[PDB]
Design a protein around this ligand. Structure first.
Ligand SMILES: [Cl-]
Ligand SMILES: [Cl-]
Ligand SMILES: [Cl-]
Ligand SMILES: [Cl-]
Ligand SMILES: [Cl-]
Ligand SMILES: [Cl-]
Ligand SMILES: [Cl-]
Ligand SMILES: [Cl-]
Lengths: 238, 238, 238, 238, 238
């Protein structure tokens, strides 16, 4: 067997997947939820085809593909992109596990790279069947009419619905070229409504401001430093 | 088994295949027929070697290789190019299914990239045996004397005929560098005669005009906008 | 099993192979013989690793690797280059078949890319053993002393001789950069002497003249057309 | 199987691994310890996927992946980088061996590429569990809070701890672009404290000085030589 | 099984291997010995992963990897480089054969690419164990202290010694960028002393002179020809 899921059964699990993707939208959202709900590391994906590494998080070695849990919610995180065939093999194992445990919901978190000059960033959605499309509509999420969703999200959407599970994908609009905690927040907001979780997305919006403030400040200091050096060169040498 | 066909039996099926190819001729033709005959999604190809995705069509997740049906006609569609060995594996499974169900006809839809400065775009044809060549001649389709037909179309032509099925390929002449709904229409016209379907190719010809009108109009507005900006720069700054 | 030879037994077969190669010498020679001896398509090579296609010849679908026959002569043709390991696998199956049927002769047709400024184009030869070298000498074919022969020809030469079959390769000298029906003719001439076939190589030499006449004429008309356009531009605009 | 560990059992082994990596920090450290503790070559990794070579050390042929030993300490050395899947396969076999022999400690030596203009080069650490983190803290090694450790080190850290073994990684800060015996020395110092070995890191610090002195001296002589040649050209030819 | 050695048993064989490598030193040496000792072609390596070809030597088809013999000495020759894993597989089969027949010596011939401006070209050596190092010392061959020997030579050295066979590598220093019959001669001289063969290396040194004389002469005639053409252009056209 190329891929082994090492993951305890969690009956009627709500499974949320945020693999790396455009904007890191899914990934930031999933990681934020795992943190804010004080989830434990409950399992991981094991395969010879996952390249050798340990991530170190709060001084604990963790594998690159892992599962976090707090009673009934599982969150699936990855820190690497993976080749297509391996993704498919992992998706197979995940869907087997979700059938086994009669998972209540299968939710994939994703990003949609969508220009620069858009006023507000929406969250789009798609459901396994018309029933799930209706649910998403009733949380005021725009349903995606035409498109493609590649990667784990796209495969889970199809595979999980085909196995009779209620499956969804949320796609936060983002620039498409950078980590975007704001778009992740939009997605986490939709997830609050969907699951009644009441997690504040403030720390996420704070994080975004602090990054942008830091960038502005570093650019200021860089340019101020070269202007000082030019003025200094001229007074010394003209 | 590398490829699983998930497809109910349709006795004495007329199987039509329009995989992506030059001009998207086959693909547009097949997709148009599926739509205009209000076909249902009846099946799909499943394989670890098909890269992970869902297509979203009218807000429903669908796999990239799928089958549409309406009583006795099956239409095979793909939204991705596929590597040669996988194509061969899919062809094997398709031909097995068509033997099983005693398919009446196996028709591949394709394009022939053929210059720019040709007055009219023809439709060529080829049959599994001289019997099918004769049929195509009697619908005034030119028989291809010398050529190669690569991809699924070429393989099905040979494999299906070798298994005792009546097999054909229709090739719409096209530019060779762009989606061509007009050439698809030519092919759909030939398919009407062949199967007595009376599907209007008007919406297809309309679609082509609207695309071209839109392009012309956007190019007009683009060029008019830069001329305005030049005039504006000059009045402001000369 | 990666490669299946679908080929009826032909006792004491004279097997001639002309796979694509420098100059298309082998290939043109083999194809010409098959045509001029009104051979039938008697079989083919079947493998998932042969890329999907049908060639269309005289309006009949044929596979890319095929066998032509007329009582006791088999001619093996291919329309594609193939990767080394697959070539070896095909060679194995071919040699098994030739042992089975006690083949009388195993002849590979090939080209030798050899400069531009040579007056005459020779045909070289090599035999499985000194006995076959002697035969070739007695038809005034130069024996190749040192060299390598890659591809199917080289493998068959060795494998067929090692299985106790009389094996040969004929190599028509050619430019090395273009289809050369003249060099093919040289090879077919040697094959006439070797097998007493009396096939005229005139149509081949005719074909070469007509191609060269067409090229000269097109180049004339091209250059005459731009001279006319220059004269026309000058009279219009000076 | 694809990888065979040829290695005698050493009960309750202290296993130290220094595979090549940034700075050659791990590698230099491990190699130095093996030498200074007069270890014997006790085993090696054998695999068809290890490229064919012998290293020659003190006139003895040795394989590229080898194990050195002196009563209870095993040191694992490699002289080549290896592809990820092979690394994982080797890690599997190593961890199996370490379970078998109830290894006391599993220590990976590594480097951390970390800029140029840093005052001191530290040594960081990480442990399989909080118990080992505590040990490292009590030798005044900074515990790594966040990061990733790729390669054999990262995999062993996780795999060995998951099999109930006490596992650690030491990471010497280094420039990141060159062999760094100084950083290796820092790591060997930490290893002395951890295992009570009292190995002098002087020869290592000496080695670093001699390399740097040699570089400076060669650059001096090069530049002095071209200045002499310029002066000589001018006196000869002006 | 990927590689079959077709090679009669030769009890207590002296096995000499000269696979292509830097300078073609090994290869020229091995080939020269096979010729000068009037060896017969006794066997070959057979594998689907050896690319299809025949070499033609004195008008006989031979495989690219072959074995020459004269009572008790086997010489292994290859005319192609091979991928690492295949080399390892061939080495496995060779060492199995050498255990089977209780081979007396396993000698690899190789080159060491080593600059341009060296007065004399030495021959270095290395032995499987200290016993063989001593033998080589007693024929005044310098023992290599540190280095790596890649390819078949390196693998045989290790594998054959690990199977209890007496194994050696001789490395002729050479430029590193061209066929070097002189360095091959140096190696053949050492092989004479080692095995008491008294083969004159004169024809080899003669061959080198004739090549160099030919090069000088061709370069002379080339340059003399363009000078003549310049003089001729000037007298015609000034
Ligand atoms: Cl990341
Ligand atoms: Cl200045
Ligand atoms: Cl498309
Ligand atoms: Cl201006
Ligand atoms: Cl061709
Ligand atoms: Cl190294
Ligand atoms: Cl001067
Ligand atoms: Cl060579």
């Amino acid at each position: 067997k190329p891929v082994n899921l090492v993951l305890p059964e969690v009956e009627n699990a709500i499974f949320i997947e945020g693999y790396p993707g455009v904007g890191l939208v899914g990934h930031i959202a999933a990681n934020f939820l795992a943190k804010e709900l004080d989830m434990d590391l409950i399992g991981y994906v094991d395969s010879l085809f996952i390249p050798p590494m340990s991530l170190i998080l709060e001084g604990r070695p963790t594998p690159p593909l892992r599962f976090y849990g707090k009673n009934n919610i599982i969150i699936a995180i990855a820190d690497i992109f993976l080749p297509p065939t391996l993704v498919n093999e992992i998706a197979k194992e995940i869907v087997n596990y979700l059938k086994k445990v009669n998972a209540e919901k299968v939710i994939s978190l994703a990003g949609m790279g969508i220009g620069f000059f858009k006023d507000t960033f929406e969250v789009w959605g798609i459901g396994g069947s018309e029933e799930e499309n209706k649910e998403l509509e009733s949380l005021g999420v725009k349903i995606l009419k035409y498109g493609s969703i590649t990667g784990m999200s796209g495969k889970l959407l199809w595979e999980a619905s085909r196995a009779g599970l209620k499956s969804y994908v949320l796609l936060g609009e983002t620039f498409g070229d950078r980590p975007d905690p704001r778009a992740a927040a939009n997605v986490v907001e939709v997830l609050n409504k969907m699951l009644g979780l009441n997690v504040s997305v403030e720390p996420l919006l704070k994080e975004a401001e602090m990054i942008e403030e830091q960038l502005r400040r570093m650019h200021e200091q860089m340019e101020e430093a070269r202007r000082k050096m030019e003025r200094q060169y001229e007074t010394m040498y003209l």
